[PDB]
Structure 1
Amino acid sequence: PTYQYNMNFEKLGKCIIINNKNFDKVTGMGVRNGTDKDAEALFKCFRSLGFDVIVYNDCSCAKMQDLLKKASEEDHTNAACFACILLSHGEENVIYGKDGVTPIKDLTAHFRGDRCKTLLEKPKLFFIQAARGTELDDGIQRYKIPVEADFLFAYSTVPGYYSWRSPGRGSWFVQALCSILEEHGKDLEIMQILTRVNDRVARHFESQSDDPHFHEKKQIPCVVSMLTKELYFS
């Protein structure tokens, strides 16, 4: 027999959304057109879920690190969990700030059970919409707890691969995540939701571009769970 995370708290929790769209020339990274659409859609979804959403924009690696560090120092006692969403450029293990790159590990470590006691035994979720490389998927027709426990990372793509988005519709992963959340965010368990998102971007999306190097390409998200209980946003 096994339970669900206790959700009986004054509030669901905070939800830091980092919307990186414009990057310094020095980095040479392009303008992430469509990210605003993503942020708007996410903002609404997580608000509906009951999160206290906040959106930061074009943050430097320093701001992002500071942002999350500060957050980890706030008092989450009356919160059920925590949520952070990263929308930016990225490379394996790293994510882009306005001025450069920072290891995703450093961003999330701030919430280890030993560095944010107020979140111990509470789920800490991180949704990352960013590339993790450039590979393309051609497809085919007396109690103590691990300081590292209760983390869940919902990546848009698999390690080493690219992440797709349309400046019009927005990120595939984000498009998918919002759909399922809107439809089942309040009745399905977190892993069911993310699994349906996996299938969604896997089946209902395919690249399409003038250059054949990037035509009819595919993508599969990646979920990493260190959760110790089932998670229902209610």
Structure 2
Amino acid sequence: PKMRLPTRSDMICGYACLKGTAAMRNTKRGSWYIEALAQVFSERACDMHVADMLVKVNALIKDREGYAPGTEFHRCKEMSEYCSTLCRHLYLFPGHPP
């Protein structure tokens, strides 16, 4: 009568773009996604759990558009997404304790 586990659980995966689409990358600034991720995480890992921080990333990504005048591929878009089998809030508790 021991508790047993499913074969897979407690993962969360952030993906930079949606199924069937390519991902926006800036030769000078890296990918839209990595950049949003670092700022959301560096600012909010102190008070917001990881799935919620991935929602704020989604919010940043949704609002951004490509600046590549010339190639129709200007004003172009991407959408990120995360998938989760988490079973509890994931707080990273940065700098605690000292």
TM-score (norm 2): 0.87
**Residue 185 (1) aligns with residue 45 (2):** yes
What per-residue deviation string (whole Å, max 9, x for no partner) do you get for residues 104-163 of structure 1?
xxxxxxxxxxxxxxxxxxxxxxxxxxxxxxxxxxxxxx1011111111110011111110
Structure 2, gaps ≥5 residues long: 94-98
| Structure 1 residue 206 displacement after superposition | 0.5
SS in 2 for 1:161: coil
Amino acid at match of 2:45: G
Q: In the alignment, is residue 224 of structure 1 matched against residue 72 of structure 2?
A: no
Q: Which has the higher contact order (CA 8 A, sep 6+)?
A: 2
1:208 matched to 2:71? The reply is no
* Structure with the largest fraction of strand: 1
Q: 2:52 and 2:61 mapped to 1: Cα distance?
A: 15
| Same amino acid, percent of matched pairs | 26
Displacement after TM superposition at 1:193 (Å): 0.3
Residue 170 (1) aligns with residue 11 (2) = no
Runs of 4+ in 1 over 3 A off after TM superposition: none
For residues 190 and 144 of structure 1, the distance between their equivalents in structure 2, rounded to whole angstroms, comes to: 26
Q: Residue 96 of structure 2 aligns with which residue?
A: none
Please report the RMSD computed on the Cα atoms of aligned residues, expressed in angstroms.
0.9
- Rounded Cα–Cα distance in structure 2 between residues aligned with 1:152 and 1:145: 17
Aligned length: 91
Q: Which runs of 5+ in 1 are unaligned?
A: 1-141
Quick one: distance in 2 between partners of 1:177 and 1:186?
14
